Design a protein around this ligand. Structure first.
Ligand code: 3AQ
Ligand code: 3AQ
Lengths: 268, 269
């Protein structure tokens, strides 16, 4: 992997592994989401950020602030097969004082054709109190030298699928998968549940017949609250229609919301 | 990745990923086990085997036979950190008519020092009836041109832990983790639970205090029966022992049918 010539974006190639593919012998959306995280981490390291915190500037570390994912939006036109080489380019951009955005473009390394794209919204949070906040001018100025100055968007379209509000699923859900718990492989180096695990949990309540006859084209996921290592989750899905679904992840007991999302599936 | 000069073994390098590491900032034993499977699959493809069946010879496909893992044995001296490059060499060997063995050696790509080793026993099984069987002369003769003729063992030692029988854990278990279920990410391309998921499930019943103060040095796991995609599993552990040893049992949540038994050895950090 390497920064591009202008030092404003980062590219990395990956050869798809045997255990990374699903029933169609192509990479799962969870494998794609893990590769997006990996290239995002390698971009932060190449531009000088320490490994003891993801993209935390010097001021962020003194104020005990971290970046947290508020929303993830992924669109896949073609999933890479086992043995295929996918190239991923990633970049960041400041969004005033709301937060930061990280975008990605996926290409088939052999043909150079765009096979997917993703975008994500990140907010500042105090790691101890878990209190969200707007981005300080002091902090914002420290990371602007690593971002393109003119807007560069993976989803240019004015008011598209990546920027639409998500409604709350109403009981009763059409489908559900209950009692989902993270295991040690679902945790990161800081013992927090990996963001990709929540994508897997959302998808668990999609019926197998949809998965067997359709391919996932779009997924938008909002992150409201973390699942702890000792928490239990329920995954809820209702068809809102190509098939479209509304999703809700909530704590098994009191029903506290952890995520809400939408998926769009194309007939194979 | 590539076959070595003699075409009797295969080598591949991997750069350890951010999401592949645990609380020590080093690769988990589950990440290691996934890399071992990946290099095993790439070795089979390089020597001519089709992607529509792992290392299935021509006779095997005609008779609906597949290789299944009976035992996995892994020893790690040093876990690679995030960003480190690990080189893995793998090879196969026929073990008479019992089955085949696949071995691995792990090295730090920078220093060339051996940081781990693994070995595994594979048996022939009919895909449809799930009935085990001995390896016929015809099947054995078809894969011997891809194996070293003189024995080459990752665990040569006359008195080593990879070949010792495993006792059945007796109730009550000292520790347990109940109601474990596979999700779609735990399945392979054929909708079967990945062998590595069972390693994760075994480890789930180890107390967090042990994980936080020790590193896993050795794991031996026997595969008795598959967990289906709609099955629920219970993970049981009892301390059998500055090194801690444990006896493990995975069984179906309801009737208590055995799926795996194993042992782990942990060294104090
Ligand atoms: N994008 C990206 C990388 C990244 C994702 C999640 C996380 O906790 C740290 C880094
Ligand atoms: N070793 C190795 C490769 C391998 C492992 C499991 C499986 O089902 C197929 C291939």
């Amino acid at each position: 992997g390497s920064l591009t010539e202008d030092g404003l974006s980062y590219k990395e190639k990956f050869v798809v592994r045997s255990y990374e593919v699903g029933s169609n012998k192509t990479a799962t959306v969870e494998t794609i989401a893990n590769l997006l995280q990996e290239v995002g981490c390698n971009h932060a390291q190449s531009v000088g950020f320490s490994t003891d915190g993801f993209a935390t500037t010097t001021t962020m570390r003194k104020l005990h602030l971290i970046w947290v994912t508020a929303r993830m939006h992924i669109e896949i036109y073609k999933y890479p097969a086992w043995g295929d080489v996918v190239e991923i380019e990633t970049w960041c951009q400041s969004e005033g004082r709301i937060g930061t955005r990280r975008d990605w473009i996926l290409k088939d390394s052999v043909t150079g054709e765009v096979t997917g794209r993703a975008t994500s919204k990140w907010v500042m949070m105090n790691q101890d109190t878990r209190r969200l906040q707007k981005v300080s001018d002091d902090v914002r100025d420290e990371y602007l030298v690593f971002c393109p100055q003119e807007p560069r968007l993976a989803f240019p379209e004015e008011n598209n699928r990546s920027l639409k509000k998500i409604p709350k699923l109403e009981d009763p859900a059409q489908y559900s998968m209950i009692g989902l718990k993270p295991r040690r492989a679902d945790l990161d180096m800081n013992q927090h549940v990996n963001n990709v695990t929540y994508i897997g949990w959302v998808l668990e309540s999609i019926p197998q017949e949809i998965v067997d006859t359709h391919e996932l084209q779009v997924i938008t996921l909002d992150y409201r609250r973390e699942c702890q290592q000792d928490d239990v989750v329920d995954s809820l899905t209702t068809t809102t229609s190509d098939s479209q679904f509304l999703h809700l992840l909530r704590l098994s007991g009191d029903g506290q919301e952890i995520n809400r999302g939408t998926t769009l599936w194309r007939k194979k």
